[PDB]
Ligand binder design. Structure first.
Ligand SMILES: [Mg+2]
Ligand SMILES: [Mg+2]
Ligand SMILES: [Mg+2]
Ligand SMILES: [Mg+2]
Ligand SMILES: [Mg+2]
Ligand SMILES: [Mg+2]
Ligand SMILES: [Mg+2]
Ligand SMILES: [Mg+2]
Ligand SMILES: [Mg+2]
Ligand SMILES: [Mg+2]
Ligand SMILES: [Mg+2]
Ligand SMILES: [Mg+2]
Ligand SMILES: [Mg+2]
Ligand SMILES: [Mg+2]
Ligand SMILES: [Mg+2]
Ligand SMILES: [Mg+2]
Ligand SMILES: [Zn+2]
Ligand SMILES: [Zn+2]
Lengths: 25, 106, 101, 98, 91, 129, 83, 149
RNA sequence: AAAUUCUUGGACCGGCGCAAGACGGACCAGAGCGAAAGCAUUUGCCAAGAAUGUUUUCAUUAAUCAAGAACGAAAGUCGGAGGUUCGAAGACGAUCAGAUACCGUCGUAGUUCCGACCAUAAACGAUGCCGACUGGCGAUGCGGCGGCGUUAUUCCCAUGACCCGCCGGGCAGCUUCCGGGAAACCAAAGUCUUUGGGUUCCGGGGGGAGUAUGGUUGCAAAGCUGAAACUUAAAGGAAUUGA
């Protein structure tokens, strides 16, 4: 699991987290 | 442009020459030496062509007479050997006249 | 491990060198890193030279050459055997192979 | 020669004598004390023709400065605009001996 | 004192018409309400009377120009190209 | 830029002594350098030297023997009382028989053994052995 | 060489060294007197003159500034002066 | 090395050991400094007053013929320029760059050098205020610097 | 290897023209300039710069630098203009056990320009800046100095082109028991237990994790600052012998 793709996965997951957060705020 | 309304583009090319005495490998030229060489070719070429007609110009182009003049004129700036008129493009020509063509054919 | 002192290329005080295109594939290679062949060959190679020579309308016609310059990425250069790997100390010499034939 | 004329004007207005303005340069020309007249390139054509005619009458040189009145004034070192000026005494500067 | 952070002249539109529209109208508003220096007298008395018409308060000189700017880059490049064309035509 | 001329002089002598030369050229000169080598002179570690007088900070050419192990400078110039002097020489001298700490006092630039002999503290400059 | 004398360098190598790097700093430039072929007076000109020098009376120009030593107009001779 | 450059140049003038006056120099102190006086009125900074004296008139160093140096002679007479010459030439250059940069906004190198030049003005300006040759309230304004050349 | 594809309504090929937008080969180098990112047709204009030369001027005005500021490839975002080629997405043809790929044909955003954002790259020499010292040798670029002799202008002086040296900065190279280093290797990565030239940033076993949260910047994408609980005896570097 090369770090470039791991970082890309992390960014997508973080974007989903953020969206789900202002959906609730 | 010639005396008759033939407008031409003359491309000339030159290569700096290594000396027989020379030990160095490169034989390059300073950028100012290059700048004043190509304004020497540009100056000579127009003079050799604009002062006379097409047929006189062609007779110069059959040998490398224009190129030979470039050889002698720029030895004092930087010696350079392989000079020719690399290409001549004819851009615009006067109105066709059947009389003048026959002079070109005798 | 630092394999080569110069990093396989010839860039010393530039920072950037423009890229060129390989000839075998279209791999984009920096100009100084690419392996450059300059092959100069006749049009007819070795066995037809007699055939055209006798069929020529001119007397003692000097056959023209063909000047084409090649560029190679490291992958194509190895796979085409223009360059091959060498022993660690033999990597250091950089005189081209003999040019007698 | 713009740099050198800027230098000469700075020296002239450090040491010698001058008048700034059309209505006073005219007085100096009519009295004949004007040694040189300098005009900006954006002054009205009517008055620049007038100044040239007066200078021709009085045998005086005129110089067409190569900038408009704003930077003519800044070249003078003043914080306003001058279109025409008259050097009356060159002082220790070679403005007349251009 | 400084009374606003981002909005300048477009502070008069309140919360209307959208952030992007307000931003892209701000620069045009500033350009059309700015005072320009007159190339004929050197004073900064150039006002836009109507769209395309600029006036000097001191010269009483009127110039045809851009809709929101005193002159446009298209106008200046056309002027330079036309000057060069005339120079070539008269050789 | 150049900040401590004495640091440069002693580093230059130490490199040329380490490589076995016979003379060293010390580019900047000052009273502190001339007074420091005269202390090294009196104990036989260096030979006699010579200062060249241009109308600027002069140069010095120093004759070397083979006796110098290391000369050094301490930065910054700490102040040292008579109570601290035994601890300083415990740190930066090889043994208790030889080696010297040069330290300036109100009595002048002078090494540690006799600086104790006239009961004066001072500011540490360097060491040699 | 370990024991080379730094105190007494020969005039040969002491001449090749850089002006600031001599044992005692010294300039490589000098003063000279230049006389016009026509006029009679002699004028004192710096070797690296750096300015267009013309003999008083504007009879002619003496030397032309260059990147190094000033080139002298021809016919004019010179001799360097000392003290 | 240079203050605002990575170059490390060593080229500099090397003053001779002998600070006497040569025998072949016949000008005495009094008529040398009137030669300096009339050159100031032609309009010349002290930098080139000393230049056109050591190549046409033979005086190697004015400070060796007289007891004073050129800029010290001038203000002792009243002909010194109002602001120091080295600060003057920075302001003159920063005005030219600022004008050129004003006409074409895409010259990034011109913007970078202008930062460097105006930095050297402020470094030098606060030095002259510590030695009290500029008034303590003297400030460099980019708008008004054009008037004083 | 083929197919998708175009093709007697004339493709591909040969000739003559026209238009359009990109791009600037060969020369082109362990050459140059720039703070770095970067920069390659000619000519002109405008402003800047290093080094060299200096018996010019001022006389310590300096060095490194929290906070703060200017520039910052590619990609990406926003308005316009233009859109040749190439080509994320997508479509189809192959191959394959599958093939949302590598191969092929077509092709959108983009790739180009103007004006605004973004501030990250293996943004690398994986190597802070300033200063001093410590071996040689042959080169190369710039400037300067000197010298046999060739070759131009010719009409000789002097400037050019070669040749032989010297000096100062610069890009590198070869060699070395200088010395260092775990070693690979480095004339610096040396002058360090014989430990102190000045100063800035920054690391403290591996993960969790550049993550959560808070703050701040941005139109967005994201940038900067940045934990803990918990988990685990190793993770790792250089070299050696095998496979
Ligand atoms: Mg490997
Ligand atoms: Mg890069
Ligand atoms: Mg600094
Ligand atoms: Mg080309
Ligand atoms: Mg910071
Ligand atoms: Mg970009
Ligand atoms: Mg883009
Ligand atoms: Mg767009
Ligand atoms: Mg498929
Ligand atoms: Mg395609
Ligand atoms: Mg980073
Ligand atoms: Mg890094
Ligand atoms: Mg330590
Ligand atoms: Mg840890
Ligand atoms: Mg276990
Ligand atoms: Mg690693
Ligand atoms: Zn390839
Ligand atoms: Zn007006």
């Amino acid at each position: 699991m090369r770090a470039k793709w791991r970082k890309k996965r992390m960014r997508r997951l973080k974007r989903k987290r953020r969206k789900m957060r202002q959906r609730s705020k | 442009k010639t005396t008759d309304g033939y407008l031409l583009r003359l491309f000339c090319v030159g290569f700096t020459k290594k000396r027989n005495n020379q030990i160095r490998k490169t034989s390059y030229a300073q950028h100012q030496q290059v700048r004043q060489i190509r304004k020497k070719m540009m100056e000579i070429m127009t003079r050799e062509v604009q002062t006379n007609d097409l047929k006189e110009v062609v007779n110069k182009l059959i040998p490398d007479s224009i190129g030979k003049d470039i050889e002698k004129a720029c030895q004092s700036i930087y010696p350079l050997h392989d000079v020719f008129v690399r290409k001549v493009k004819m851009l615009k020509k006067p109105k066709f006249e059947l009389g003048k063509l026959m002079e070109l054919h005798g | 491990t630092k394999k080569r002192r110069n990093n396989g290329r010839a860039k010393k005080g530039r920072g950037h060198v423009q890229p060129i295109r390989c000839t075998n594939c279209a791999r984009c290679v920096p100009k100084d890193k690419a392996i450059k062949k300059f092959v100069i060959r006749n049009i007819v190679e070795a066995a037809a030279v007699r055939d055209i020579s006798e069929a020529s309308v001119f007397d003692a016609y000097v056959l023209p050459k063909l000047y084409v310059k090649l560029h190679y990425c490291v992958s194509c250069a190895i796979h085409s055997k223009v360059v091959r790997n060498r022993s660690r100390e033999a990597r250091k010499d950089r005189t081209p192979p003999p040019r007698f034939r | 020669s713009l740099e050198s004329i800027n230098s000469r004007l700075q020296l002239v207005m450090k040491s010698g004598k001058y008048v700034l303005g059309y209505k006073q340069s005219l007085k100096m020309i009519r009295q004949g004390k004007a040694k040189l007249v300098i005009l900006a390139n954006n002054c009205p054509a009517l008055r620049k023709s007038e100044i040239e005619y007066y200078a021709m009458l009085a045998k005086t040189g005129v110089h067409h400065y190569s900038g408009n009145n704003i930077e003519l004034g800044t070249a003078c070192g003043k914080y306003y605009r001058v279109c025409t000026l008259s050097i009356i005494d060159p002082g220790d500067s070679d403005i007349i001996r251009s | 004192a400084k009374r606003t952070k981002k909005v300048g002249i477009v502070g008069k539109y309140g919360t209307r018409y959208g952030a992007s529209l307000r931003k892209m109208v701000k620069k045009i508003e500033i350009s059309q309400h700015a005072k320009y220096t007159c190339s004929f007298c050197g004073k900064t008395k150039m006002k836009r009377r109507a769209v395309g018409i600029w006036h000097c308060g001191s010269c009483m000189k009127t110039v045809a120009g851009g809709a929101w700017t005193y002159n446009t880059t298209s106008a200046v490049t056309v002027k330079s190209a036309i000057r060069r064309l005339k120079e070539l035509k008269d050789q | 830029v150049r900040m401590n001329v004495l640091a440069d002089a002693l580093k230059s002598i130490n490199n040329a002594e380490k490589r076995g030369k016979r003379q060293v050229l010390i580019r900047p000169c000052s009273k502190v350098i001339v007074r420091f080598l005269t202390v090294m002179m009196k104990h036989g570690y260096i030979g006699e030297f010579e200062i060249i007088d241009d109308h600027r900070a002069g140069k010095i050419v120093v004759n070397l023997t083979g006796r110098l192990n290391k000369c050094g400078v301490i930065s910054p110039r700490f102040d040292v009382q008579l109570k601290d002097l035994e601890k300083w020489q415990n740190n930066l001298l090889p043994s208790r028989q030889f080696g010297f700490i040069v330290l300036t006092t109100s009595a002048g630039i002078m090494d540690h053994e006799e600086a104790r002999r006239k009961h004066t503290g001072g500011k540490i400059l360097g060491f040699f052995f | 060489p370990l024991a080379k004398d730094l105190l007494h360098p020969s005039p040969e190598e002491e001449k090749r060294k850089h002006k600031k790097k001599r044992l005692v700093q010294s300039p490589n430039s000098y003063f000279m007197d230049v006389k016009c072929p026509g006029c009679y007076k002699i004028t004192t000109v710096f070797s690296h003159a750096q300015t267009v020098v013309l003999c008083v009376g504007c009879s002619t120009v003496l030397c032309q500034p260059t990147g190094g030593k000033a080139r002298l107009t021809e016919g004019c001779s010179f001799r360097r002066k000392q003290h | 090395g240079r203050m605002h450059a990575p170059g490390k140049g060593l080229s500099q003038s090397a003053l001779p050991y002998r600070r006497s006056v040569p025998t072949w120099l016949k000008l005495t102190s009094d008529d040398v400094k009137e030669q300096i006086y009339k050159l100031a009125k032609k309009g010349l900074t002290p930098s080139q007053i000393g230049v056109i004296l050591r190549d046409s008139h033979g005086v190697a160093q004015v400070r060796f013929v007289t007891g004073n140096k050129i800029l010290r002679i001038l203000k002792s007479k009243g002909l010194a320029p109002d602001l120091p010459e080295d600060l003057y030439h920075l302001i003159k250059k920063a005005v030219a760059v600022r004008k050129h940069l004003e006409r074409n906004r895409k010259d990034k190198d011109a913007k970078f050098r202008l930062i460097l030049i105006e930095s050297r003005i402020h470094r030098l300006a606060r030095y002259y205020k510590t030695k009290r040759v500029l008034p303590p309230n003297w400030k460099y304004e980019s708008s008004t610097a054009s008037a004083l050349v």
